[PDB]
Every structure is written in C-alpha cells, then in structure tokens.
Amino acid sequence: PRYLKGWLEDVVQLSLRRPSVRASRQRPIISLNERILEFNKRNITAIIAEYKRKDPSGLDVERDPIEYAKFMERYAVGLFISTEEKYFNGSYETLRKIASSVSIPILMYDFIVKESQIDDAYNLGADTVALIVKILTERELESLLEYARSYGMEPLIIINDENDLDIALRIGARFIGIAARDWETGEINKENQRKLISMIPSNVVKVAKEGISERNEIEELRKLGVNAFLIGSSLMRNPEKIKELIEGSLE
Structure with a gap:
C-alpha cells in the first residue's frame, strides 16, 4: 500500500490480515455499471443505496439488513455493502445473507489491499468491489483491477483529488467514484467534487459519493455528466427518503 498514517494506516494493516472465506457463490455476476447505464437510458434516476452499520462520519444504526435490502430492491440501481470490521462495524456474513436475498447488483465496500479479498467478494456473492486510489499504489491498483476483471467484475475506482x-484514468478505470469527503479530516468539498467530475471522459461511468441529499442536486449533477449517486447514511436512517430522490415530491 501507499505511505499512510492514522486510521487509514490502521485499517490497511487490519485488512492485510482479513481471513479469506470458502463460501461458494450462488448467484450470477450482474454488472452494476451496466445497470447504471441502463437506468440512464430509461431516464430512471440511479441511486446506489448503502448498507452500513457504522461509518466513521456517522452514528451506528442497528436495523434488520435483509429488510432494508429488500426494500431497496424496489428503488435502488444497486447496493453498496460495507464489510470493514473496525470502523464500519461490518461483516462478511451480512454481505453473504443480503446477497442470498436480493437480485440487484451489489458492491462489497471495504479496504481492498490483497487478492483474497476479491476472492471473498466473489465467493460471498458481491457483483463488484471498490478499489481506493488513496491507499493503493499504482502497481497494486492495476494488479487488483486486472484480477477483479478476471472474475468478470468491473470495480468502482474511488478518487477524491486530481492526482488520484x-x-x-492511467490504470484504465472505466467506473469511477468521485468522493466529496476528505479521507483525513472528514470534511466535504463539493466544489472539488464537481471540478473532478468535469475532468472525466464521457465514456467513464461516474458515481458521485457523499454530499447528495436532494433531487435538485441530483438533476444538476446528471446534467454535468454524473451517471449514478451513492447515498448511504441518509437512507440508513430513513429508507423512504429514496422515494423523493427518484420520483420527486408532492411536498
């Protein structure tokens, strides 16, 4: 991994030691990026809903994850399931049970630093994974991206600054997440997020992460080329907020 400090250094070391699984996959691989493009063509707003028990920039929520996932099947273009143990209070078993219960695309969100974690994603039923440019060297990124593609997955490559x-783009990303949040301070900068979005080629499937809360924002960002929208904590607390984001409101 790259030179790191603080919590990211900690989580990378934890992830290096994450035990692999021998679960067996019992669903096909269905493309999240392709379903996003389908929604775009159908003029259906594409929201990727997150399941996460905890986020370093949020409070813990203890809800039934299966009940949540099945609700989101009605609305979401896919699910983003957080499996990191220490900071996201996650579990491989939660991913596995949700995957066993739904038919929409699932991204396993964790700090992927070794090939066995991609094996884990495949074996547990996730359709894809995220790779994080902040923590992986160019060489690691390219290797893990190639490895994921060998399973038939298209990873979401997450960035939050110009160099990343x-x-x-250099490593051949086709599916990019533009995060508004700073990894170190937790601060949100939407001006930066938009600047980055404006620099991405049209043929890349673009997902905005963080800072999305209103239909108006979503439509603004669609016009700027964003294809889909990751929305997590807001929905973890009030799932039905997704209705207005997709359908508009009477209110």
Missing part, C-alpha cells in the same frame, strides 16, 4: 483521478 489521473492515476485512475
């Missing part, structure tokens, strides 16, 4: 965006 260049690296994402």
Whole structure:
C-alpha cells in the first residue's frame, strides 16, 4: 500500500490480515455499471443505496439488513455493502445473507489491499468491489483491477483529488467514484467534487459519493455528466427518503 498514517494506516494493516472465506457463490455476476447505464437510458434516476452499520462520519444504526435490502430492491440501481470490521462495524456474513436475498447488483465496500479479498467478494456473492486510489499504489491498483476483471467484475475506482483521478484514468478505470469527503479530516468539498467530475471522459461511468441529499442536486449533477449517486447514511436512517430522490415530491 501507499505511505499512510492514522486510521487509514490502521485499517490497511487490519485488512492485510482479513481471513479469506470458502463460501461458494450462488448467484450470477450482474454488472452494476451496466445497470447504471441502463437506468440512464430509461431516464430512471440511479441511486446506489448503502448498507452500513457504522461509518466513521456517522452514528451506528442497528436495523434488520435483509429488510432494508429488500426494500431497496424496489428503488435502488444497486447496493453498496460495507464489510470493514473496525470502523464500519461490518461483516462478511451480512454481505453473504443480503446477497442470498436480493437480485440487484451489489458492491462489497471495504479496504481492498490483497487478492483474497476479491476472492471473498466473489465467493460471498458481491457483483463488484471498490478499489481506493488513496491507499493503493499504482502497481497494486492495476494488479487488483486486472484480477477483479478476471472474475468478470468491473470495480468502482474511488478518487477524491486530481492526482488520484489521473492515476485512475492511467490504470484504465472505466467506473469511477468521485468522493466529496476528505479521507483525513472528514470534511466535504463539493466544489472539488464537481471540478473532478468535469475532468472525466464521457465514456467513464461516474458515481458521485457523499454530499447528495436532494433531487435538485441530483438533476444538476446528471446534467454535468454524473451517471449514478451513492447515498448511504441518509437512507440508513430513513429508507423512504429514496422515494423523493427518484420520483420527486408532492411536498
């Protein structure tokens, strides 16, 4: 991994030691990026809903994850399931049970630093994974991306600054997440997020992460080329907020 400090250094070391699984996959691989493009063509707003028990920038929520996932099948273009143990309070078993219960695309969100974690994603039923430019060297990124593609997955490559965006394009990313949140401070900068979005080629499937809360914002970002929208904590607390984001409101 790259030179790191603080919590990211900690989580990378934890992830290096994550035990692999021998679960067996019992669903096909269905493309999240392709379903996003389908929604775009159908003029249906594409929201990727997150399941996460905890986020370092949020409070813990203890809800039934299966009940949540099945609700989101009605609305979401896919699910983003957080499996990191220490900071996201996650579990491989939660991913496995949700995957066993739904038919929409699932991204396993964790700090992927070794090939066995991609094996884990496949074996547990996730359709794809995220790779994080902040923590992986160019060489690791390219290797893990190639490895994931060998399973037939298309990873979401997550960036939050210009140099990391260049690296994402350099390594051959086709599916990019533009995060508004700073990894170190937790601060949100939407001006930066939009600047990055404006620099991405049209043929890349683009997902905005963080800072999305209103239909108006979503439509603004669609016009700027964003294809889909990751929305997590807001929905973890009030799932029905997704209705207005997709359908508009009477209110």
